[PDB]
Design a protein around this ligand. Structure first.
Ligand SMILES: [Mg+2]
Lengths: 139, 138
């Protein structure tokens, strides 16, 4: 009945970000970022590191705020409204590789080059990229 | 107990922004921006103009997204957690003056020059400003 807060993480690895196909009632099979719901009392940075750990096993650091998007899902089975806070981060150990830690929510994680992204993107992400957003150009 | 979305509005009037002292269980008497809770299905820009209307009677246009802050209020009687989306906007008529529409929540609104802001600012706001954030440029 109310807008809910989610945190999504751009893990910047060379020229690539991490994406995985959703297993979900909303945006099923589309490519999306790791992340999830902000917990009460939790900071954006703690949420980003926690969700990434829980979903991918990756240890990330240097979390920085990117932007925020308003995602109203009208056609969902139960209508939902999410406010999506995006975070950029990098691996702690640069040799790390993801693991599909939550196979019920995701088909698997992989690195995709910014200029060879997969399709279809989860539509909030498609809309953000369509606006010209680029997580690599904020120093 | 769950994070809730608020929208706050920097109403840019020349060199100044609108602020008023809160009457609240949280940040009582500190200077804060107009704002309020995001409604289901609402856009940031819609919520910005609705809450500013409800609270000040002012008409704003040219809403543009600024940034977002995580405001956890652990001190509070009931602990609160607000995720605060800031919007920049300007008056339709740069001469319209504010009205204290919700006196139970605000001592009253006034314009404050960016280079001579009032004290004490509501702490999420001074934190944001301390980071170098500037609503006129950002
Ligand atoms: Mg690089």
């Amino acid at each position: 009945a109310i807008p809910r807060v989610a945190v999504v993480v751009f893990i910047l690895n060379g020229n690539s970000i991490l994406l995985g196909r959703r297993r979900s009632s909303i945006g099923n099979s589309t490519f999306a970022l790791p992340g999830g719901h902000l917990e009460f009392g939790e900071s954006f940075e703690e949420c980003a590191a926690r969700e990434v750990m829980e979903e991918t096993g990756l240890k990330i650091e240097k979390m920085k705020l990117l932007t925020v998007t308003n995602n109203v899902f009208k056609e969902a089975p139960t209508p939902s409204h999410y406010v999506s806070v995006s975070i950029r981060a990098v691996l702690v150990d640069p040799s790390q590789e993801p693991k599909n830690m939550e196979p019920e929510k995701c088909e698997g994680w992989d690195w995709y080059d910014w200029e060879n992204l997969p399709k279809p993107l989860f539509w909030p992400l498609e809309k953000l990229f369509g606006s010209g957003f680029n997580p690599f150009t904020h120093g």
